[PDB]
Amino acid sequence: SLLTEVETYVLSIIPSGPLKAEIAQRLEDVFAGKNTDLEVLMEWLKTRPILSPLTKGILGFVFTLTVPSERGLQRRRFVQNALNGNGDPNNMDKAVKLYRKLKREITFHGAKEISLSYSAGALASCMGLIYNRMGAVTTEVAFGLVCATCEQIADSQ
Amino acid sequence: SLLTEVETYVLSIIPSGPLKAEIAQRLEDVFAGKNTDLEVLMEWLKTRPILSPLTKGILGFVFTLTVPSERGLQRRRFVQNALNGNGDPNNMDKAVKLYRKLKREITFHGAKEISLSYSAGALASCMGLIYNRMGAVTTEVAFGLVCATCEQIADSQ
Amino acid sequence: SLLTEVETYVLSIIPSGPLKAEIAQRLEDVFAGKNTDLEVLMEWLKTRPILSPLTKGILGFVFTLTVPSERGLQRRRFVQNALNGNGDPNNMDKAVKLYRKLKREITFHGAKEISLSYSAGALASCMGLIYNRMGAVTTEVAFGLVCATCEQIADSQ
Amino acid sequence: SLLTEVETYVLSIIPSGPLKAEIAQRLEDVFAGKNTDLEVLMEWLKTRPILSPLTKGILGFVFTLTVPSERGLQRRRFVQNALNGNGDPNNMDKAVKLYRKLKREITFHGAKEISLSYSAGALASCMGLIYNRMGAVTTEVAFGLVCATCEQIADSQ
Amino acid sequence: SLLTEVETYVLSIIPSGPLKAEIAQRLEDVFAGKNTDLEVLMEWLKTRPILSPLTKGILGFVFTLTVPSERGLQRRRFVQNALNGNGDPNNMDKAVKLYRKLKREITFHGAKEISLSYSAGALASCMGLIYNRMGAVTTEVAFGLVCATCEQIADSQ
Amino acid sequence: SLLTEVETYVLSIIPSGPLKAEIAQRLEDVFAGKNTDLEVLMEWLKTRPILSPLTKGILGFVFTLTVPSERGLQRRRFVQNALNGNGDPNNMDKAVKLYRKLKREITFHGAKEISLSYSAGALASCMGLIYNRMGAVTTEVAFGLVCATCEQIADSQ
Numbered sequence: 001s002l003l004t005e006v007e008t009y010v011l012s013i014i015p016s017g018p019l020k021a022e023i024a025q026r027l028e029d030v031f032a033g034k035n036t037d038l039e040v041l042m043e044w045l046k047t048r049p050i051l052s053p054l055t056k057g058i059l060g061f062v063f064t065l066t067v068p069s070e071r072g073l074q075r076r077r078f079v080q081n082a083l084n085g086n087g088d089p090n091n092m093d094k095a096v097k098l099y100r101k102l103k104r105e106i107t108f109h110g111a112k113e114i115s116l117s118y119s120a121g122a123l124a125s126c127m128g129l130i131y132n133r134m135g136a137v138t139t140e141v142a143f144g145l146v147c148a149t150c151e152q153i154a155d156s157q
Numbered sequence: 158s159l160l161t162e163v164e165t166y167v168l169s170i171i172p173s174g175p176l177k178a179e180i181a182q183r184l185e186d187v188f189a190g191k192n193t194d195l196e197v198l199m200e201w202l203k204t205r206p207i208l209s210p211l212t213k214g215i216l217g218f219v220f221t222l223t224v225p226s227e228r229g230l231q232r233r234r235f236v237q238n239a240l241n242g243n244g245d246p247n248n249m250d251k252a253v254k255l256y257r258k259l260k261r262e263i264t265f266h267g268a269k270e271i272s273l274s275y276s277a278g279a280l281a282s283c284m285g286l287i288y289n290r291m292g293a294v295t296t297e298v299a300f301g302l303v304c305a306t307c308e309q310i311a312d313s314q
Numbered sequence: 315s316l317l318t319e320v321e322t323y324v325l326s327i328i329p330s331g332p333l334k335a336e337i338a339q340r341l342e343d344v345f346a347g348k349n350t351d352l353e354v355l356m357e358w359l360k361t362r363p364i365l366s367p368l369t370k371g372i373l374g375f376v377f378t379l380t381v382p383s384e385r386g387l388q389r390r391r392f393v394q395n396a397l398n399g400n401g402d403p404n405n406m407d408k409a410v411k412l413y414r415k416l417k418r419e420i421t422f423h424g425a426k427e428i429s430l431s432y433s434a435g436a437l438a439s440c441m442g443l444i445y446n447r448m449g450a451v452t453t454e455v456a457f458g459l460v461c462a463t464c465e466q467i468a469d470s471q
Numbered sequence: 472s473l474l475t476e477v478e479t480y481v482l483s484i485i486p487s488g489p490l491k492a493e494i495a496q497r498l499e500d501v502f503a504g505k506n507t508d509l510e511v512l513m514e515w516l517k518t519r520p521i522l523s524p525l526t527k528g529i530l531g532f533v534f535t536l537t538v539p540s541e542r543g544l545q546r547r548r549f550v551q552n553a554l555n556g557n558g559d560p561n562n563m564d565k566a567v568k569l570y571r572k573l574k575r576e577i578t579f580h581g582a583k584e585i586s587l588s589y590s591a592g593a594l595a596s597c598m599g600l601i602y603n604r605m606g607a608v609t610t611e612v613a614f615g616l617v618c619a620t621c622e623q624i625a626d627s628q
Numbered sequence: 629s630l631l632t633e634v635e636t637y638v639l640s641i642i643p644s645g646p647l648k649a650e651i652a653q654r655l656e657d658v659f660a661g662k663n664t665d666l667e668v669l670m671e672w673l674k675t676r677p678i679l680s681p682l683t684k685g686i687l688g689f690v691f692t693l694t695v696p697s698e699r700g701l702q703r704r705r706f707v708q709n710a711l712n713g714n715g716d717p718n719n720m721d722k723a724v725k726l727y728r729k730l731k732r733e734i735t736f737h738g739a740k741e742i743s744l745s746y747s748a749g750a751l752a753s754c755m756g757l758i759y760n761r762m763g764a765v766t767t768e769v770a771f772g773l774v775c776a777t778c779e780q781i782a783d784s785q
Numbered sequence: 786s787l788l789t790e791v792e793t794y795v796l797s798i799i800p801s802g803p804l805k806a807e808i809a810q811r812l813e814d815v816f817a818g819k820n821t822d823l824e825v826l827m828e829w830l831k832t833r834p835i836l837s838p839l840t841k842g843i844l845g846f847v848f849t850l851t852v853p854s855e856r857g858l859q860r861r862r863f864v865q866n867a868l869n870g871n872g873d874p875n876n877m878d879k880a881v882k883l884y885r886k887l888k889r890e891i892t893f894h895g896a897k898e899i900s901l902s903y904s905a906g907a908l909a910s911c912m913g914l915i916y917n918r919m920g921a922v923t924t925e926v927a928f929g930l931v932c933a934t935c936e937q938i939a940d941s942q
Contacts, residue, residue, distance in 0.1 A: 109314045114668070119822070138211065139207070140209050190333060274518045276665075488659065488660065490661055521631075521767070523767050628630075644786040677854075681923060713891070784895055
């Protein structure tokens, strides 16, 4: 089950506490098709205390991927900044190269496999690149990048 | 049973969840002769969240094949784009060659056998080619291409 | 039993489903002398969804053979096209040669035996040739050609 | 049993693995009269990975010999090249001389006996010569050349 | 069994550890016909830590030989460099001479026997020469060169 | 097992205590592919108390060799100084000569054998030379130099 892989990977980087429970429920609802309103979800995310900016960027990215329900919605600066990590030459260089590989992919595992060859910083940078143009890659490839990013992150701790 | 082969192959590339169940039921009805209205089905497909564009193109292609019930209906750009994959020299080259072989076929297995020699990308590209001119090949050959495409895809994961 | 051979051969190329059942019943009635109205049957055939053009041509050919009940009826373009396969040099060449052999035959098995030496494409092409002039051969020879054509077809799958 | 000799000789030059099993089955079917479609078989052969070009040429040659089922089919460049070995003066000279001896033969063993006096390279070259004009020699002589070629090859390893 | 010889020779030069296990599995799959995607495999190879460049060149060469599945794929500079060893007059001279002998060969053992008369450095240099034009020799000869190269290498330790 | 040889040689020059245990674990992880971040490891090394500068240079050299994970990373002055030993004519002269021999090598044992003919001071000096241009020699040769250096050192005590 693909969506259960995303969910498990994403939750893995969130520290334990009541906030996590709330993130587990919202993720479950979005991945269940239980409607959703991007605008509302994002405000919520953007305002949660104790959540690392990066983790908000990863969640914001995931909610933007699924539950499109955008309707001309603009990109959230708070997602772009946490993803672009805001500065760090090099890593950005690796991000561009990964972005080029992912563009040739179509599947979740294919994207996930090649992505696992980069560090969390570059992976996050690459997510920031895709976020600028979500339609650059397929939804399955994007999801593959998300997990890898989360895998490398949880491994950092 | 031919139609059960298509159904099993097509469902295999859809990730688990309530959406799949809904796809399983619609496919069952179309393959049961339970009437159907292409126009309605396609709008539905075109608007499902979490379904990969490619998978919509494969489904859109299948619904166009069976349940003709078209009535002068035009080709759905959302099917053509997801199939033509939109860009990728080479693969398209293999697609043309496959298209030439399928044109000489008449049966499901014959078409399926030779098709299994190409990659998912080329197979999908070939489906895009047939979609432009559905009458290029027989319905059985087209169905053979669908399965192979699905087989190679599920094998990608 | 001759007519049971035709029936079994013809049904063998039709995929399973409720439509087949309906074809099994109509064939049974025609072969039972249960009257019939060519005009009505053909409209029905011509309008069935999911039936391959070829299979309609083979059925249309059989219904034209038996249950004459024509009454000056013209040839159905939808039968001629599905049979003539509409284009394919060569195969047509073999069709002509077969047509020449069948003209010397009088029996079902004689016609069936020599016919089994050609491919489905040529056999179908030959049926198209006979369809232009049904009286070219005897009804038993025509029936022999039908089975062989069906035998070679079901063997293609 | 002649055909069992060809089969054993041909398989002897194919390295072990699942591909061999598939070659063993197809050879068995062709030599069993189980119909066959040259065009289909050849595409398959032409596209198998890990099979040495030469071995494809030998198989392509054998399938062309038996299961004629050609129908005006042209010679496969991929068979001619692997056989003509594509360049090598001398050896070609021996090939011509062998070709002259085989033309006087009629039987399998006669052809096989004299053929065993040449090297694999010349034998393969000679097969290439016959392939240009299959009707140059009798089918039994051709089969004799195939085995010898295979015998000398397996002896090379 | 030829392919088991390649596998055993290739693994022999890889030091023990979990990485070897992963190489053993991928080699097994490629040699089993289990599809494969050259592009993907190579990226993987190119990015493995602790693998000596040379060993990557030997593996890259083997994967290029089998599982063609190239599709117009270009030569990997990381394979050419590790093979051409990048500089070393003389040895290159022996490589050219070996290249000339292998061109006259057709079998695995023939190529392997004569190859075993050169040192690992020259053998590797010769592999680099073939890599520039894979079609210079037959697949069996190439495989013979691979083993010898591996034999001489493992003997160096 | 190559990597176990490096590990045993490297640990042999570290005096007993809890610090060694920590070095044993980090070396084990790096040699296990357990990711790693050169930048982090080096800071750690650079800041350990009681470790002789030389031993840090040898470790820094090893971590730079494996777990490349550099990404444009610059050479660590603290590694260069401990290796170049910072001054000592002569020995440096032997280092250059060894550097010239190693450049002709490709394997671990070959490099290790010839290296064992020099003293620890020259060997260390030679490591300093390679460190300036890591790509001067193959990874296996470099590893051979490391052990010899460690062998000669532990023999000094």
